[PDB]
Fold this sequence. Notes:
Elements: H1 3-12, E1 21-22, H2 23-30, H3 36-43, E2 57-58, H4 69-79, H5 93-96
Parallel strand pairs: 1-2
Helix pairs in contact: 1-2, 2-3
Amino acid sequence: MDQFLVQIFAVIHQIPKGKVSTYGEIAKMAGYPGYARHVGKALGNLPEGSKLPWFRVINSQGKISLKGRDLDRQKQKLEAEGIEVSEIGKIALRKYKWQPLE
């Protein structure tokens, strides 16, 4: 359990209802610029239904991080929050962007 994990997860616990964020943002806000790809490499190892909400953090491409079955599985957990997920796991960040400062 690296401090890297502790930090990025602490940021994930702060993701609100109906809003999502990207690995690029999470990494910078956690104090690890350029480790966005590593954040995803960690979330992919999480058990679905874990106390830590993995599904709320997607890629900087504006799409679902996992593919195949976990694509729709993440998608469903997003739909439960009221989030649009199109065919390729496409999420409109323009309206689902997490705004930490209003």
